[PDB]
Amino acid sequence: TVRWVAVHTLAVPTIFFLGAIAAMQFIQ
Amino acid sequence: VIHSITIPALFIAGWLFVSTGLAYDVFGTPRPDSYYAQEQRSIPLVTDRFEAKQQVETFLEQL
Amino acid sequence: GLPWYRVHTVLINDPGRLIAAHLMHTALVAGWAGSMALYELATFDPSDPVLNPMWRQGMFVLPFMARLGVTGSWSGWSITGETGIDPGFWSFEGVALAHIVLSGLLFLAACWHWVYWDLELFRDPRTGEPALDLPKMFGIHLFLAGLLCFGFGAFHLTGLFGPGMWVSDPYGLTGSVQPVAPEWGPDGFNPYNPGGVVAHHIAAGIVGIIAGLFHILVRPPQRLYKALRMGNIETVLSSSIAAVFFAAFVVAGTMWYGSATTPIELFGPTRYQWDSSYFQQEINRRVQASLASGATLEEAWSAIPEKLAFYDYIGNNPAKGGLFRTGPMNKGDGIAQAWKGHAVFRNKEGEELFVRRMPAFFESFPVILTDKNGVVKADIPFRRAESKYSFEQQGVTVSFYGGELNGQTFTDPPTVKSYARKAIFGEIFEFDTETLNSDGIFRTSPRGWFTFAHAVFALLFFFGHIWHGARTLFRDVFSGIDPELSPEQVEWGF
Amino acid sequence: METITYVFIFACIIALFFFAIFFREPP
Amino acid sequence: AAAAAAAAAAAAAAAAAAAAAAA
Amino acid sequence: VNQLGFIATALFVLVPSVFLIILYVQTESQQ
Amino acid sequence: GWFDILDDWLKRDRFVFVGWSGILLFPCAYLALGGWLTGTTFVTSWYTHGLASSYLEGCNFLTVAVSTPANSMGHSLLLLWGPEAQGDFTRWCQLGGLWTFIALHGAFGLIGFMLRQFEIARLVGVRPYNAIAFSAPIAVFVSVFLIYPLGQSSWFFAPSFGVAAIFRFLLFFQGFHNWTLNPFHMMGVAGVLGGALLCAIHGATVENTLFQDGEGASTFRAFNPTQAEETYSMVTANRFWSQIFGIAFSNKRWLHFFMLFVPVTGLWMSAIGVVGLALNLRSYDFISQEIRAAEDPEFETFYTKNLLLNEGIRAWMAPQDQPHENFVFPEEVLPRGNA
Amino acid sequence: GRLNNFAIEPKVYQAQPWTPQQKVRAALLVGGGLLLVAGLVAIAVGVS
Amino acid sequence: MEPNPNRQPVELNRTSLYLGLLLILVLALLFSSYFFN
Amino acid sequence: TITPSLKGFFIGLLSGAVVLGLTFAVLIAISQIDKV
Amino acid sequence: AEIQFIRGINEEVVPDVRLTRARDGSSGQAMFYFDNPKIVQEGNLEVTGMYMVDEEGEIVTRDVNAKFINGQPVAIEATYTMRSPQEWDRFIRFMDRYAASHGLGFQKS
Amino acid sequence: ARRTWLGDILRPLNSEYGKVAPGWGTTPLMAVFMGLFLVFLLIILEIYNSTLILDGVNVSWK
Ligand code: CLA
Ligand code: CLA
Ligand code: CLA
Ligand code: CLA
Ligand SMILES: CCCCCCCCCCCCCCCC(=O)O[C@H](COC(=O)CCCCCCCCCCCC)CO[C@@H]1O[C@@H](CO)[C@H](O)[C@H](O)[C@@H]1O
Ligand SMILES: CCCCCCCCCCCCCCCC(=O)O[C@H](COC(=O)CCCCCCCCCCCC)CO[C@@H]1O[C@@H](CO)[C@H](O)[C@H](O)[C@@H]1O
Ligand SMILES: CC1=C(/C=C/C(C)=C/C=C/C(C)=C/C=C/C=C(C)/C=C/C=C(C)/C=C/C2=C(C)CCCC2(C)C)C(C)(C)CCC1
Ligand SMILES: CC1=C(/C=C/C(C)=C/C=C/C(C)=C/C=C/C=C(C)/C=C/C=C(C)/C=C/C2=C(C)CCCC2(C)C)C(C)(C)CCC1
Ligand SMILES: CCCCCCCCCCCCO[C@@H]1O[C@H](CO)[C@@H](O[C@H]2O[C@H](CO)[C@@H](O)[C@H](O)[C@H]2O)[C@H](O)[C@H]1O
Ligand SMILES: [Fe+2]
C-alpha cells in the first residue's frame, strides 16, 4: 500500500538470485 | 525501521534451487553431462513451428 | 518574423486559405498520378508478359491501376497480352488524362479559395473570430467516407456495377480481373482471401455510416473535449498523423508479406517465397506427377511453363537489391528471353549432384554441389586454393532437360563451372544484357521500393505525431497565452 | 566531371568557411 | 430470382434525402 | 557511371540554396 | 468519486512519481528487466542457436544473452498460451519466447516512459523537449529490434540481448550488409560523435568562464531546473571561441537546441538506414567501382579490400551463426588471402 | 523576435435541452438512417 | 476589401543562411558518391 | 469449431482482462482508502 | 492570507501584482512581481510552485519563473490565469484577505 | 464578409462551434467500443501471424 513494494519486488528476487549465483560457482 | 524477519532463508532458497537440480527442470536448461546424446554429434535445433514442443520432448528421450 | 519552418502556419486561423492549400496539395497528388501514368505508359514493353512483366520493368503506378480493373490501353494491347481489345475510355491513358484534368480543376478551385478567403461559413455570427465545428466535421467526413467505402465495396468489387479486382491462382500463372463475392465467415480474415476485402468494405462502410450519423447528432462530452483539446485544429492533425502512420505500417506489412491485394503478377514474388522454396516445391511436384504418368525427364521438364520457372529465380525476389542500385530489374541483369532448362549435374559414375542455392543474405555465395544426403562431392574453389573436390578431378558434367537447351550435355569444365555459378541462383535463364546496357548486379522489385518508402514514411510520421501532440496539449506554455482566456483582455492594477 | 563535382562542393565549403568567419552577422 | 437489391435502392436513396434535409 | 547522377547532385546543391538565398535577400529588403 | 480520486492519488507527491503513465511503464519495465535477469541467469540458447548463454551453464557477464528464437518460428509472437509452447513454461523458455517477452515489454515500457515524460512536463508546466529527445532511442529500438527482423526471415536475425551477442550483431552488419559504407549510418556516427564532442566542449567552457571563480564567490541560491545556467558568462565564452575557432554561439537557447538537435537527428538517420537494411536494401557496392575492378585485376582501393574482408566475415561466421541453413563449407571454398 | 501562430478555440458551452425544431430534425436523422442501413443490408444480401 | 490580415513576414538571417548552406553542402558531399555510384 | 489455438487465445484474453481489471481494482481501492 | 513558495515557509516580501480581466467577466490571471524575495537569497530548498494558502482552501500557481542578473537572481515573476469566474471570485477573495493583512493599494485604472 | 449561396446552405453545420455534452456523456460506450476494437485488432494480428489457427482458415497462398 506504500513504497514498501520496492523491497518486495526488487530485493526478494535479488537476494534469491545472488543465492543462486553463489550456488553456481560450486558446480563441477 | 529495522527488518530482519527472513534475509538468509532466501539465500538458502536460492542455493537449494541450483544445488538440488531444480533450475534445470524449471527453466529447461540441460545438465552439463546432458548436452548431446550418447552416440551422435548433432545439435537439436527446432526445425518446425507447430511441432517444436514435440521436437524438444522428442530429443529429451534420447538422454 | 516567422522562421522558414513556420511559414505554413499562417493558415491556422483562416479556414478558406487552408482549403486553398489542401486543394493545391491534392492538385499536386493528382498531377503526379497522371504524370507517373504517362511516363510509365511511354517506357513500357507490353510484348512479353511471360518473362517481361510490369514488376520487372520498374512500373510502380501501373500495378495500382491494373489491380482495380484497368486492363488495356488505347494503343491496342493488354496487361494480359491479347494485342486487341476495346477497353472503352478507361484505359491507362484515359485515367491519366482524367487525373490531369482533375489536377487542373483542383488548381482552379485552389486559386478561387485563395482569393475569396473570407466567407460567412467560416466565422461565427456572434464573435468576429473564425471557428470550425470539428466534432461535427468528423461526422460529415466519416459519413462520406463510409458511404464511399460501402459504394466501392458493394458495387465495384462484387462486379454488380464495375470490373472486379485482380485475382490470381496460388502461383501467379492465370490471373486477371474478375468479380469476387464477399466472404462472410472466418475465412474473410485470411489476408489472401479476396472475398474478405469485399466483405470488409461492405461491413466497414455500414459501420462508418452509423458512426458518422452518430457524430452528426451527438456532441462530445465536456471531459474529453477539454482533455483532448478539441477546438484546436492541431489535435486533429495529431490523431490524423497517428492514423496515417498506423496505416502506412499496415500497407508496408501487407506489401512485404503479401496478401490478396498485392499479387505477384503485378508486384512480383516475395522473399518468403524464396525462403520457403515455394515455387520449387510446386515445380518438383509437377515434374513428379508428370513422371508418374509414363513420361521421360524431357517430357516432364518440358511441360513446365516459363512463368513458373521465372518465379523460381533469385533475381526476382525483392530482398536481392541495393539502396542506390537504381531503375528497373532489366537494368539489373537484362531482359529475360527464354528458359534454358533444368540443369542436372553428374559425377562421372552417374550420381546426381545438387547445387546448393544462394540465400538472400549473401552478396556472393560459393558454388557447392552435394548429394541427396548432404555430403559435399564437388565445388568450385575460391580463387587458387588447392582443389581436392574440383570440377575436373570429380568429372562433373551438366545436362539440360526442357526449355531452350533440351537434352544438351556439356562436359568441358569452364562451361560446367559457368552453369553451376548460374545454378546457385535458382533456375537458369537467357538474359539480353544489351539494349539497356545492363550490369550484373541485382535490383529490387516495386514490392521492395514500396515497403522501403512507406516504412521510412511511417517512422518519420511517428515523430510528426510526437511533435504535434506535444504542440497541441502544451499550447499555453509553447505560446505563453492560455487558450481558454479570451484575447480581448483589459487590466485592473493592484 | 565526377572528380570536379567533389572538388567544387569542397571548394564551396571552404568559401563558406571564409564567409562565415570574417563576414559574420553582427549582434 | 427475388428483387432484393432492385427495391433496396429506393430504401437506400430516400434515406439519404432524410439526412440531407434534416441536416 | 551515372550521367543523370550529376544532375541529382546539382539539383541537390542548387534548389535548397536558391530557396535560402531568395529568403535572405528578400528579408534584407524589409526583413 | 470514481475518477478524480484516482487522478489525484496518482499525481500526488511521493518518493517516485507514478502517474497514469506508471501503470503502463512499471509492470512492463519491471517485467522486461526481470525477464532479462532470469534469462541470463537460467535460460539456455541450445535449442534455438546451439549455444550456452547463461550463468547456469558457466558464462560470465559478457557472454550471457537472452537469445533470439529459432528461424523456424518465423515472426511468431511466441505467447505462453500460444500454439508453439501451449502453456509449458519449460518449452517456452527453450524455444526463445523470453526474447519476444523482453522485446514487447521493452517496447511498451519505452512507450510508458515517454508518456511519463509528457506527464511530468504537463505537471511542472514546461515544454516537453525531453520527450521529443526520447523519440530517438525509441526509433532506434523500433528500427533495430522490431522492423529489422520483421523485414528479414524471422526473429532469429535480431540483437540477442547480450554483450557479446551485440558484438556479433555489429560484425554481422559489417559482413553481410557493409553497414559502415551506408550514408545514414555515417550521419548516425556523426550525430553521436558530435554530441559527445558538444558535451565535452560545453562542460569545459561553462566550468571555465564562471562568474565567480573563487575569490569573491558569493554562493547564490541555485535551482536545479536551470541546470546551473546562471553561473557562467556568455560574453567571455563567445570572446574565447570567436578567436580560437572563429565561430561561436551567442545564445543560451540556440546552443541548447543544438545539443538537443545533433544526436537525435543522428540517431533518427541511423534508424532510417536500419529500416532500409530490413529489406536488404543496403549500400553495399559502388557499381562503377565494381566495373573498374572487373576491367583490370591490378586495381585496388581500400573499398575493394573491405569487400574481401566482408566476404571473409560472411563465409567464416555463416555455418555457426546460422545453423538452421546447415552450411557445409569445405576448406577449399573458404576465402583466404593467400589464394 | 521570431513570431509564431496558434489556434483560436471557440468558447466551451454546454449543450442545452432541445426544442421541437432540433428534436424533429434529430428524429428525421435517426429515422432516415435506420431505413438507410436497412436498405444497405438488403444490398449486402443481394450482392452475396 | 480586407487583404487577409495574416501575411506575417519571413525572416532568415545570415547565420541561418550559413547553417543551411553548410547542411546542404555537406549533404551533397556525403551523397554525391552514391548518386554518381 | 473451437481449435486449441482459439481456446488458448481465450485463455490469454481472459488472463489479460483479469490482470488489467485486477490492477485497476487494486489501484481504485488504494486510492479510495488514502482519500485525504 | 499568506503566499508560500515552499509549503511550510511563507514569503515575507510583498509582491507587485497587476490583475487583468476579460471583458466578459469570465477569464483573467494576475502577473506577480516579487522584487527581491527571501526565497531568492538563501534556503537551498526546491520550489514546487507558488502556493497561496487561505482559509477557504488554496490556490496553486505553477507558472513561476525567476529573473537573473549576472548569475544573481533578483526578481521572481509569476503569472496565474483564471479561465472561469468561480476561480476569479476565489482569487479576488484571497486578494482582499491578502491586501487587508499586508497593505496593498488596489489602484484601479 | 461574403454571404454566398453555399454559405447560407451549409451554415447549420458550422453553427455549434464549442457545444459540448455535460459531464462524461458517452465515454463508457466509447471505452467498451475501444476495447472491442482492441480485441478485433488482436484477432486479426494473430490470424495473420498464424498464432490463432482457425478451422477452414489457411493463411497462405493455398
Ligand atoms: C513512395 C515513393 C516511391 C517509390 C517506392 C518509387 C519506386 C520506384 N520508382 Mg518512382 N517516383 C517517385 C516516388 C516513388 N517511386 C516520385 C516522387 C517521382 C518524381 C521524382 C518518381 C519518379 C521516378 C522515375 C523518373 C523513375 C522511377 C522509377 C522507380 C523504380 C526505381 C526506384 C529507384 O531506383 O529508387 C532509388 C531510390 C533511392 C536512391 C533512395 C533515395 C534516398 C534519398 C536521396 C535520401 C535523402 C536523404 C536526406 C537528404 C537526408 C536529410 C538529413 C537531414 C534531415 C538532417 C521503383 C519501382 C524508375 C523506373 O524504373 O521507372 C520505370 C524511374 O526511371 N520513379
Ligand atoms: C499531414 C502531415 C503534416 C502536416 C500537414 C504538417 C504541418 C505543419 N508542421 Mg509538421 N511534421 C510532420 C507532418 C506534418 N506537418 C512529419 C511527418 C514530421 C517529421 C518529419 C513533422 C515535423 C515538424 C516539425 C519539427 C515542425 C513541424 C511544423 C509544422 C507547421 C509549419 C510547417 C512549415 O511551415 O514548414 C515549412 C517547410 C519548409 C519551408 C520546407 C521543408 C522542406 C523539407 C524538409 C524537404 C522537402 C519535402 C518535400 C517537399 C515534400 C514531399 C513530402 C512527402 C514525401 C511526404 C505545420 C502546422 C513546425 C511547427 O510546429 O511550427 C510551429 C515545426 O517546427 N512539423
Ligand atoms: C512512444 C509511443 C507514443 C507516445 C509517447 C505517444 C504520445 C502521445 N499520444 Mg500517441 N500513439 C502511439 C504512440 C505514442 N503516442 C501509437 C503507436 C498510436 C496508434 C496509431 C498512437 C495514437 C494516438 C492518437 C490517436 C492520439 C495520441 C495522442 C497522444 C498524446 C497524449 C497521450 C495519449 O493519448 O497516449 C496514448 C496511449 C498510448 C500510446 C499507450 C498505449 C498502450 C496500449 C493500449 C497497450 C496495448 C498492449 C497490447 C494490447 C499488448 C499486446 C501486444 C501484441 C503485440 C501481442 C501524446 C502526444 C493523442 C493526442 O495527440 O492528443 C493531442 C491522440 O489523439 N496517440
Ligand atoms: C466481416 C467483416 C470484416 C472482414 C472480413 C474484414 C477483413 C479485413 N479487415 Mg477490416 N474492419 C471491419 C470489418 C471486417 N474486416 C470493421 C467493422 C472495422 C471497423 C471500422 C474494420 C477495421 C479494420 C482495420 C483498422 C484493419 C482491418 C483489416 C482487415 C484485414 C485483416 C487482414 C490483414 O491483412 O491485416 C493486416 C493488418 C493487421 C494484422 C493489423 C496490425 C495491427 C498493428 C500490429 C497494431 C500496432 C501498429 C502500431 C503503429 C505499431 C507498429 C510497430 C511496428 C513498426 C513494429 C482484412 C481485409 C486490417 C487491414 O487493413 O489490413 C490491410 C486493418 O489494419 N479492418
Ligand atoms: C527539386 C529538388 C530536386 C533535388 C534532387 C534530389 C534527388 C535525391 C534523390 C536522387 C535519386 C537517385 C538519382 C540518381 C539515380 C537516378 O537517376 O535514378 C532515377 C530514379 O529516381 C527515382 O526513382 C526517385 C524516386 C525514388 C523513390 C524511392 C523511395 C524513396 C523514399 C524516400 C526515402 C527518404 C529517406 C532513374 O533511374 C535511372 O533511369 C533508368 C531508366 O528509366 C536507368 O536504369 C538508369 O540507369 C537510372 O537507374
Ligand atoms: C569539409 C567538411 C566540413 C564539414 C563542416 C565542418 C564545420 C563545422 C563547424 C561547426 C558547425 C556549426 C556549429 C555552431 C552552430 C552555430 O549556431 O554557430 C553559429 C555560426 O554558424 C556558422 O557560421 C555556420 C558556418 C560554419 C563555419 C565553420 C568554420 C569553422 C572554422 C574553421 C577554421 C578554424 C580556424 C553562430 O551561433 C548562433 O548563430 C545564430 C543561430 O540562429 C544565433 O544568433 C545564435 O544565438 C548563435 O549566435
Ligand atoms: C491548368 C489546367 C489544366 C492543366 C493541368 C495540368 C497539366 C496539371 C499538371 C500537373 C502536374 C504535371 C503535376 C506534377 C506534379 C509532380 C509532383 C508533385 C512531384 C513531386 C515529387 C516529389 C515530392 C519528390 C520528392 C522526392 C525527390 C526529390 C526524389 C527522391 C524521393 C523524394 C520523395 C524525396 C488543363 C489544361 C488540363 C485544364 C484545367 C486547367
Ligand atoms: C520472465 C517471466 C516472469 C518474470 C519474472 C521476474 C520479473 C523476475 C524478476 C527477477 C529479478 C528482479 C531478479 C533480480 C536479480 C538481481 C540480480 C541478479 C543482482 C545481482 C547483483 C550483483 C551480482 C551485484 C554485483 C556487484 C556490483 C554491481 C559491483 C560491485 C560488486 C558486486 C558483486 C557487489 C513471470 C514469472 C512474471 C511470468 C513469466 C515470464
Ligand atoms: C592546392 C590544391 C591543388 C589541387 C590540384 C588539383 C585541383 C583540381 C583537380 C580537378 C580535377 C580535374 O582532373 C581532370 O578530370 C578529368 C575528368 O573530368 C580527367 O579525365 C579522366 O576522366 C575523363 C572522363 O571525364 C576521361 O575522358 C579521361 O580519359 C580521363 O583522363 C582528367 O584526367 C583530369 O586532369
Ligand atoms: Fe548548459
> In this complex, which chains have at least 3 CB pairs below 8 Å with chain C?
E, F, G, H, I, K, L
Q: Check CB contact under 8 Å for L52 and J1.
A: no
Chains L and G physically touch (3 or more Cβ atom pairs below 8 Å): yes
The kind and range of the H/E element at C336 are: strand C335-347
Resolution (angstroms) stands at: 3.1
Q: Which amino acid is at C63?
A: P
3 state SS of J12? helix
3 state SS of H48? coil
Task: CATH number of the domain at J2, please.
Answer: 1.20.5.510
Q: Domains in chain B: how many in total?
A: 1
CA distances from D25 to G249, I17, L53 (A): 12, 10, 68
Neighbours of G67 (CB within 10 A): 27
Indicate which technique resolved this structure: cryo-EM
Does any domain span residue B37? yes
The total number of residues shown for chain B amounts to 63
Chains J and G physically touch (3 or more Cβ atom pairs below 8 Å): yes
Known binding positions of G: 105, 117, 130, 185, 202, 249, 256
Cβ atoms H48, C181 nearer than 8 A? yes
**Which atom of ligand 5 is nearest to C328's Cα?**
44
Q: Which residue has the cell 523458455?
A: G93
Q: Compute φ and ψ for K51, nearest 5 degrees.
A: -100, 125
User: What does the DSSP 8-state code read for residue L2?
Assistant: B
Rounded to an integer, what distance in angstroms lies between the CA atom of residue C294 and that of residue B28? 52
Q: Check CB contact under 8 Å for B14 and A16.
A: yes
Rounded to an integer, what distance in angstroms lies between the CA atom of residue I33 and that of residue G232? 44
Q: Which amino acid is at G12?
A: R
The secondary structure of G165-205 as a DSSP string is: HHHHHHHHHHHHH-GGG-HHHHHHHHHHHHHHHHHHHHHHH
CA K57 to chain CA centroid, Å, is: 15
Q: Domains in chain J: how many in total?
A: 1
Cβ atoms C245, H37 nearer than 8 A? no
Nearest CA to ligand 9 atom 4: D7
Give C42: exposed, middle or buried? Use CB within 10 Å, 0-12, 13-18, 19+. exposed
I36: nearest CB among F6, F27, F31: F6
Rounded to an integer, what distance in angstroms lies between the CA atom of residue C366 and that of residue G336? 13
**Contact L50/G at CB under 8 A:** yes
Cβ atoms G169, G159 nearer than 8 A? yes
Q: Compute φ and ψ for B46, nearest 5 degrees.
A: -70, 120
- Distance between F19 CA and the closest CA of chain C, angstroms: 10
Q: Which residue has the cell 537469445?
A: G67
Q: Check CB contact under 8 Å for A20 and B23.
A: yes
G84: nearest CB among B29, B32, B52: B52
- Which residues sit directly before a break in chain G (C to N > 2.5 Å)? none
Q: Give Cβ neighbours of residue K28 (< 8 Å, ≥ 6 apart).
A: C485, C489, K19, K20, K21, K22, K81, K82, K88
- Does the C-beta of G121 come closer than 6 Å to ligand 3? no
Neighbours of I11 (CB within 10 A): 18
Rounded to an integer, what distance in angstroms lies between the CA atom of residue C147 and that of residue E16? 10
Q: How many Cα atoms within 13 Å fall on the side-chain side of residue B31? A: 10
Query: B48 CA distance to ligand 9 centroid (A)?
Result: 59
Q: A3 labelled as ligand-binding?
A: no
Query: Residue K34 forms beta bridges with which residues?
Result: K76
Q: Compute φ and ψ for G300, nearest 5 degrees.
A: -155, 115
CA G292 to chain CA centroid, Å, is: 37
Cell numbers at residue D4, please? Answer: 570536379
Residue B10 belongs to what domain range?
6-62
Nearest CA to ligand 1 atom 12: C36
Cβ atoms C191, L59 nearer than 8 A? yes
Q: Pocket around ligand 5: residues whose beta carbon is below 6 Å from it?
A: C 326-328, 331, 449, 452-453, 456; F 2, 4-5, 8, 11-12, 15; G 272; I 35
Q: For residue G138, give the nearest of G271, G275, G278 by alpha carbon.
A: G271
CA distances from C445 to B57, C169, C172, C373, C448 (A): 42, 20, 16, 35, 5
Q: Which amino acid is at C77?
A: W
Known binding positions of G for Fe cation: 202, 256
* B26-59 CB burial, b ≥16 within 10 A, e <16: ebbbbeeeeeeeeeeeeebbbeebeebbebbeeb
**Contact H6/L at CB under 8 A:** no
**Rg for chain K (alpha carbons), in Å?**
14
Rounded to an integer, what distance in angstroms lies between the CA atom of residue C416 and that of residue F8? 43
**Which atom of ligand 7 is nearest to C35's Cα?**
12
Where are the domains positioned within chain K? 1-109
Rounded to an integer, what distance in angstroms lies between the CA atom of residue G50 and that of residue G324? 10
CA distances from J11 to G76, G82, J24, L48 (A): 18, 10, 20, 19
Q: Check CB contact under 8 Å for B32 and A27.
A: yes
Does any domain span residue B1? no
Pocket test for ligand 4, best of C147, C192, C200, C206 (most atoms within 8 A of CB): C200
CA distances from B17 to A14, A17, A18, G46 (A): 14, 10, 12, 21
Rounded to an integer, what distance in angstroms lies between the CA atom of residue G303 and that of residue G305? 5
**Rg for chain D (alpha carbons), in Å?**
12
- Across G93-185, where does the E strand assignment appear? none
Where are the domains positioned within chain C? 1-270+444-494, 271-443
- Does the C-beta of C2 come closer than 6 Å to ligand 2? no
Cβ atoms G155, G73 nearer than 8 A? yes
The kind and range of the H/E element at G301 are: none
Q: Check CB contact under 8 Å for G56 and A17.
A: no
- Does the C-beta of C254 come closer than 6 Å to ligand 4? yes
Q: What residues of D are in contact with residue I24 (Cβ under 8 Å)? A: none
* I14-24 CB burial, b ≥16 within 10 A, e <16: bebbbebbeeb
Cβ atoms G325, G317 nearer than 8 A? no
Pocket test for ligand 3, best of G108, G111, G145 (most atoms within 8 A of CB): G111
Rounded to an integer, what distance in angstroms lies between the CA atom of residue C241 and that of residue C235? 10
Where are the domains positioned within chain L? 1-51
Rounded to an integer, what distance in angstroms lies between the CA atom of residue C348 and that of residue C345? 10
**Contact I31/G at CB under 8 A:** yes
Rounded to an integer, what distance in angstroms lies between the CA atom of residue G271 and that of residue G273? 5
